Amino acid sequence: SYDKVSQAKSIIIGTKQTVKALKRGSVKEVVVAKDADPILTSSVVSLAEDQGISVSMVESMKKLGKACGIEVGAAAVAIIL
RNA sequence: GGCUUAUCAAGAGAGGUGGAGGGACUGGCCCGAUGAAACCCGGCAACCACUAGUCUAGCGUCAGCUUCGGCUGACGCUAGGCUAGUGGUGCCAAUUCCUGCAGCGGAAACGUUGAAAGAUGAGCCA
Numbered sequence A: 001s002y003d004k005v006s007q008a009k010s011i012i013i014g015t016k017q018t019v020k021a022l023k024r025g026s027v028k029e030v031v032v033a034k035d036a037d038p039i040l041t042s043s044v045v046s047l048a049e050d051q052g053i054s055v056s057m058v059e060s061m062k063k064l065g066k067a068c069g070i071e072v073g074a075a076a077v078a079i080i081l
Numbered sequence B: 001g002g003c004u005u006a007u008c009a010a011g012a013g014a015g016g017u018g019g020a021g022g023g024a025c026u027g028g029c030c031c032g033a034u035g036a037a038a039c040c041c042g043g044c045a046a047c048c049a050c051u052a053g054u055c056u057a058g059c060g061u062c063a064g065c066u067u068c069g070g071c072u073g074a075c076g077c078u079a080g081g082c083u084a085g086u087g088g089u090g091c092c093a094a095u096u097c098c099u100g101c102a103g104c105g106g107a108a109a110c111g112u113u114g115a116a117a118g119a120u121g122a123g124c125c126a
C-alpha cells in the first residue's frame, strides 16, 4: 500500500538508512519493494522479521520512491512513528 | 574580491563517513535513496617553489689524442630540458556535459572555427 507511505508522518528512505533505523527500534513498520535487488531487500526483511517488526511489500521500487517524495525510486522505506 | 596571463577534445577507487539534491547562469538534457553535496582516504595530473638525480651546451682546471686545425673524458660552475620526491594548489560522470553571438563540412545523424560566459594556476592590486 503506497498510501500507508504517502500518508505516514515521518519515514526513512533507502536500505542503508533503514537498516540503521531498525537498529534503534524507532521503526513502526517497514515497506519493501519486490522488484528491487533481493540481496538488498532480504537484508531488511531479516532485520525486520527477526525484530518482530511488521513488513509490507509493494510491487515497484519506482512507485515507492514516488510515494516518499523522492524522484528516483527506493528499495525500502522505514516508517518512523 | 579584481586585473594580466597560461590551459581546458586525455587521466584518475562498484571506495569510508554522510544524508537530498548536483551538473555556474541560461533553455535543455543528464546524475541521485541500488545513496546527491560536504568531509576523509585513495588516485590523476604536472600549473608555482624547493630538493636532489639525469641529459645538453658554454666555460675552466687538470688528461690523453691530434689526419695536429681540433676532438674525447673526468671534474666544477653557469644555463636549460627531463624525470622523481617534498610543499602549494587543482582535479577524479558526461568535450568547460550541450545551447547561449557568428560561421564551417555533410544528405541527415553527426563533426567542427572563433568568440561569450566559466573554471584552475601563477604574478600583481586589494
Ligand SMILES: C[S@@+](CC[C@H](N)C(=O)[O-])C[C@H]1O[C@@H](n2cnc3c(N)ncnc32)[C@H](O)[C@@H]1O
Binding pocket: B006, B007, B008, B045, B046, B047, B089, B090, B091, B120, B121
Ligand atoms: C583545465 S585548468 C584545471 C586543470 C585541473 N587542475 C586538472 O588537473 O585537471 C588547466 C590549468 O590548471 C592549472 N593547474 C593547477 N594545478 C594543476 C595540475 N595539478 N595539473 C594540471 N594543471 C593544473 C594550470 O595552470 C593549467 O593550465
Ligand SMILES: [Mg+2]
Binding pocket: none
Ligand atoms: Mg564573494
Ligand SMILES: [Mg+2]
Binding pocket: none
Ligand atoms: Mg569577473
Ligand SMILES: [Mg+2]
Binding pocket: none
Ligand atoms: Mg581548440
Ligand SMILES: [Mg+2]
Binding pocket: none
Ligand atoms: Mg561517493
Ligand SMILES: [Mg+2]
Binding pocket: none
Ligand atoms: Mg538529519
Ligand SMILES: [Mg+2]
Binding pocket: B035
Ligand atoms: Mg553510501
Ligand SMILES: [Mg+2]
Binding pocket: B083
Ligand atoms: Mg619515470
Ligand SMILES: [Mg+2]
Binding pocket: B092
Ligand atoms: Mg573519485
Ligand SMILES: [Mg+2]
Binding pocket: none
Ligand atoms: Mg550558434
Ligand SMILES: [Mg+2]
Binding pocket: B104
Ligand atoms: Mg554550414
Ligand SMILES: [Mg+2]
Binding pocket: none
Ligand atoms: Mg534532431
Ligand SMILES: [Mg+2]
Binding pocket: none
Ligand atoms: Mg549541433
Ligand SMILES: [Mg+2]
Binding pocket: none
Ligand atoms: Mg575568456
